[PDB]
From Swiss-Prot, chain A:
The gene is MIDN. It comes from Homo sapiens. Interacts with GCK; the interaction occurs preferentially at low glucose levels. Interacts with the proteasome. It is found in: Nucleus, Nucleolus; Nucleus; Cytoplasm, Cytosol. Contains three domains that function in concert to promote proteasomal degradation of bound substrates. Contains a ubiquitin-like domain (Ubl) toward its N-terminus that is necessary to promote substrate degradation. In the middle, two domains termed Catch1 and Catch2 are necessary and sufficient to interact with unstructured regions within substrates. The long C-terminal region associates with the proteasome. Facilitates the ubiquitin-independent proteasomal degradation of stimulus-induced transcription factors such as FOSB, EGR1, NR4A1, and IRF4 to the proteasome for degradation. Promotes also the degradation of other substrates such as CBX4. Plays a role in inhibiting the activity of glucokinase GCK and both glucose-induced and basal insulin secretion. This is Midnolin.
Swiss-Prot record, chain B:
This is 26S proteasome non-ATPase regulatory subunit 2. The chain holds residues 261 to 519 of 908 of the full protein. It comes from Homo sapiens. Component of the 26S proteasome, a multiprotein complex involved in the ATP-dependent degradation of ubiquitinated proteins. This complex plays a key role in the maintenance of protein homeostasis by removing misfolded or damaged proteins, which could impair cellular functions, and by removing proteins whose functions are no longer required. Therefore, the proteasome participates in numerous cellular processes, including cell cycle progression, apoptosis, or DNA damage repair. PC repeats lie at residues 138-171, 172-208, 209-243. Component of the 19S proteasome regulatory particle complex. The 26S proteasome consists of a 20S core particle (CP) and two 19S regulatory subunits (RP). The regulatory particle is made of a lid composed of 9 subunits, a base containing 6 ATPases and few additional components including PSMD2. Interacts with RPGRIP1L. Interacts with CRY1 in a KDM8-dependent manner. It comes from the Eukaryota. The gene is PSMD2.
Length: 33, 248
């Protein structure tokens, strides 16, 4: 349980970092305009 | 007089009336000003790519820039100096879980969204070593407060240094995400997605922490997605009455 749970946590972490970088890109793009 | 018109519109509890007042949008300056008030009050506007200045008004209401503006003001008369619990105190004028967590709480209160960074890591390691009884996720949520509204810095720091074993530490990550997103509006669901993912985990206390983080990340948002995700799992016969109450 521990290993699978931590692996899923990490996978979700990379997905969240993808979302975060997308947010940065869009936010800075709109800021500069 | 749109700004104070909107103020009285909020005073009268009718989001429909508030939207009607906001609709006019005859002036860009006043439109942005009233968007600022709506965002600060946290009232959630409803529209899409259908009007002028839609993007900037949406960002204003969502409060994406609040953290940057706060940090900018702090830089002006820079106050980005982490302070030791004793320094906040003055003990010089004259370590169980209890006082360890108390000091962590004091540090979190004093350093609000200032990015403690080095002192952050120092106290993090301290209370991680002092993990004992109630040396639980509490201090991780404390780090969350130190990174309050710091979607960038808070999320990054917790992600790189958190999770793993110690379901209490994972609940700490969940509540840190919730704190970071608290009063922070954005279509992205960095807290909502995670807390919904780990809502159904058997661990009673970790599930409790996840649901608390989910509630407090978007407290007052008033949307229906998380309500539909949570109300079905209100039934806590399989869990504890404290879990029922906190979900409520």
């Amino acid at each position: 349980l521990r290993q699978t749970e931590n692996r899923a946590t990490r996978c979700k972490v990379e997905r969240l970092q993808l979302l975060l970088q997308q947010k940065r890109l869009r936010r800075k793009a709109r800021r500069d305009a | 007089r749109f700004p104070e018109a909107l103020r009285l519109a909020l005073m009268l509890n009718d989001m429909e009336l508030v939207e009607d007042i906001f609709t006019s949008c005859k002036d860009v300056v006043v439109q942005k000003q009233m968007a600022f008030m709506l965002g600060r009050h946290g009232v959630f506007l409803e529209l899409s790519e259908d009007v002028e200045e839609y993007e900037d008004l949406t960002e204003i209401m969502s409060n994406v820039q609040l953290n940057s503006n706060f940090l900018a003001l702090a830089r002006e008369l820079d106050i980005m100096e982490p302070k030791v619990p004793d320094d906040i105190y003055k003990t010089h004028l004259e370590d169980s879980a209890r006082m360890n967590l108390a000091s962590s709480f004091v540090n979190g209160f004093v350093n609000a969204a200032f990015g403690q960074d080095k002192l952050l890591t120092d106290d993090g390691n301290k209370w991680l070593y002092k993990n004992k009884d109630h040396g639980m996720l509490s201090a991780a949520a404390s780090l969350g407060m130190i990174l309050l509204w710091d979607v960038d810095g808070g999320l990054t720091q917790i992600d790189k240094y958190l999770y793993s074993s110690e379901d209490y530490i994972k609940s700490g990550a969940l509540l840190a995400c919730g704190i970071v997103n608290s009063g922070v509006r954005n279509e992205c669901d960095p807290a909502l997605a995670l807390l919904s993912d780990y809502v159904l985990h058997n661990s009673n206390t970790m599930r409790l922490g996840s649901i608390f983080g989910l509630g407090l990340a978007y407290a007052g948002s008033n949307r229906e997605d998380v309500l539909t995700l949570l109300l079905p799992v209100m039934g806590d016969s399989k869990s504890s009455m404290e879990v029922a109450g906190v979900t409520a």
